[PDB]
Design a protein around this ligand. Structure first.
Ligand SMILES: COc1cc(N2CCN(C)CC2)ccc1Nc1ncc2c(n1)N(C)c1ccccc1C(=O)N2CC(F)(F)F
Length: 247
């Protein structure tokens, strides 16, 4: 039961519920998410603040006593997880363009002291004409050191596992894990569940042969600095955005 929404939008098929939406004024297609709670209240507060071309935007929200309505950008290219599956490996020029998108989104979030802490291929949508980061369910504002161990372990930084306290740079660690997966088809820390944790805490970035023989040393160098165990020495999003591989 929308009302003010029906005057501005034309709801279509269905994909909490998700349905296609069409903006009357622009003829642009949008997604409408119908949600029937402090953690949900927190997530929408970030959605209102974050506006970047490499982030899935929240166009508007209507809050009613029974349910909650969100109109958001619709991306038809699917998530990076599915795209990685069919192609397996990407060219260096394609992958650096994606890192440009992800690092741009990360830099913007960190200028707001927001850590996403759920940066994985399923949450990166692909746009035909780009990447967009989404799902801020784990996102938060870094008032101090964080200690909760959340996120899909393959992309989780060693300080999260160590439980000694983490901050904004865990998003950079995930960005290096993704870029690594983009260039060779497999993650830098693999495990066999406990084995995965010792690989991350050791933090040894390797570039096996034959897979990494063609990839340039500029890419290996950047990936190394993104995947540093020393958080202070680990790259910031600005340092990623100024690297020659990204430009
Ligand atoms: C045709 O479009 C798609 C197809 C696939 N398939 C994946 C599976 N294979 C088998 C078939 C293709 C996956 C995603 C999309 N598009 C899409 N566009 C916008 C999203 C969104 N999904 N979802 C699901 C999100 C997923 C991750 C992060 C953010 C969002 C997010 O906030 N929104 C806005 C809202 F949620 F409101 F819909």
């Amino acid at each position: 039961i929308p009302a003010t929404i029906t005057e501005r939008y034309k709801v279509g098929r269905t994909i909490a519920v998700v349905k296609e939406c069409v903006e009357r004024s622009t003829a642009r297609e949008y997604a409408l998410k119908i949600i029937k709670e402090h953690m949900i209240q927190n997530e929408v507060s970030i959605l209102r603040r974050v506006k970047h071309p490499n982030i899935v935007l929240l166009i508007e929200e209507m809050d009613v006593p029974t349910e909650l309505y969100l109109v958001m950008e619709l991306v038809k290219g699917g998530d990076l997880f599915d795209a990685i599956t069919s192609t397996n490996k990407y060219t260096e020029r394609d992958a650096s363009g994606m890192l440009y998108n992800l690092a741009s989104a990360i830099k913007y979030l960190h200028s707001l002291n927001i850590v996403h802490r759920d940066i994985k291929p399923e949450n990166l949508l692909v746009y035909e004409h780009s990447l967009k980061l989404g799902d801020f369910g784990l996102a938060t504002i870094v008032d101090g050191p964080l200690y909760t161990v959340c996120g899909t372990p393959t992309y989780v930084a060693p300080e999260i596992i160590a439980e000694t306290g983490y901050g904004l740079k865990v998003d950079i660690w995930a960005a290096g894990v993704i870029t690594y997966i983009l260039l060779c088809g497999f993650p830098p820390f693999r495990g066999s569940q406990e084995v995965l944790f010792d690989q991350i805490l050791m933090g040894q970035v390797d570039f096996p042969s034959p897979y990494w023989d063609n990839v340039s040393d500029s890419a290996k160098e950047l990936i190394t600095m993104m995947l540093l165990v020393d958080v202070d020495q680990r790259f910031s999003a600005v340092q990623v955005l100024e690297h020659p591989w990204v430009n």
